[PDB]
Amino acid sequence: TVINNWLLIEGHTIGIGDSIADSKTYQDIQNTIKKAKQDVIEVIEKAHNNELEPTPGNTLRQTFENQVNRILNDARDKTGSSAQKSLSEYNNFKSMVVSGAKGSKINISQVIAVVGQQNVEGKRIPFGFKHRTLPHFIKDDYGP
């Protein structure tokens, strides 16, 4: 009762301004994504040139998938951390996450920085079409 009446005084809201981040934050997120995509390209080139060597207990396919997943997840986490650094004290996404009332830092990060990898059955989006995920992509594209 008493906290709901004080909330009548102070008030609470969620708006678009909460989702917006600084221009520097957006630039850093973009740079992290570019670096991650470049690293994934390098890993793919290593695999194509047969330089890659299987991790114990894993096939070359499995170890390549694990390396690419690790790169993409680390980039996703770094973009999320940048977005969360951007948040102000007044930010209401941050307010709800800090109180624990609703939401998570994952949600804040997806809202502000990067939605992340879409995975089905524990693997990246499968090659449903013949040797490709969608008709718009070229065959044998393992890029992000």
């Binding site: 993409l72 997840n73 992340g116 990898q117 995975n119």
Partner: peptide, 8 residues
Amino acid sequence: IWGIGCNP
């Protein structure tokens, strides 16, 4: 929808 370690 996040990653392989998260949720779909």
